[PDB]
Amino acid sequence: DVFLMIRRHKTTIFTDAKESSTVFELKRIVEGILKRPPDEQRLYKDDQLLDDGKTLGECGFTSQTARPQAPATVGLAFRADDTFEALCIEPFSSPPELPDVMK
């Protein structure tokens, strides 16, 4: 029951999946939310894309690393206009300096 996080530019998705699930099933589940055909869309592990044949177990993740407290982040890119675009993670805002509590 690994919990993932799909982030594109500013959009963030909170979903859950099983290790027996596949990248094709993940694409199917994000299709119903993003209203985009799943053939073009592709996923990333911040280093290389994930093939459809490979299942969720063999690409890493696992329950120990992927927990509800600290879910893993999975990139996503669109492949519509015949040209790939660089992964724009766009990280969240930096937290402010900590108050007097630093001791």
């Binding site: 108050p99 007097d100 509590v101 001791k103």
Partner: protein, 139 residues
């Protein structure tokens, strides 16, 4: 009350934090007991039909056993001791976050924090055993 004790219970804790149990006698005054190290278990006896309360040793937080607040021993069945497992309750963010603030903030330095006025009273409201058992008398 005074009754025979043909029963024994096992105190096994699953929570990461240290557990300090307090047991209610016939008088009703819970007393401190040696702390249970995390991820351990001890074989112990008990009065039949007497409440047990499990609390944190350090900051006195709430702990749940058998998905219940109170623990009542029962008569032994076919030579099998009864097992009690302690789990961390599902704290709310307001309650969970105050625990982080309370540990970090010196108890005489609340007023220097720049937060809302209402949260000052809640932050100063340290958990207390007499308060805890007051909300269990009803029903």
């Amino acid at each position: 009350v005074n009754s025979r004790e043909p029963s024994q219970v096992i105190f096994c804790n699953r929570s990461p934090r240290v557990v300090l149990p307090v047991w209610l006698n016939f008088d009703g005054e819970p007393q401190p007991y040696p702390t249970l190290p995390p991820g351990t278990g001890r074989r112990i006896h008990s009065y039949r039909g007497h409440l047990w309360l499990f609390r944190d040793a350090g900051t006195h937080d709430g702990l749940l056993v058998n998905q219940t607040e109170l623990f009542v021993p029962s008569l032994n069945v076919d030579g099998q001791p009864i097992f009690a497992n302690i789990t961390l309750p599902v704290y709310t963010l307001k309650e969970r976050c105050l625990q982080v603030v309370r540990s970090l903030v010196k108890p005489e330095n609340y007023r220097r924090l720049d937060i809302v006025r209402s949260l000052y009273e809640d932050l100063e409201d340290h958990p207390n055993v007499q308060k805890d058992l007051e909300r269990l008398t009803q029903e």
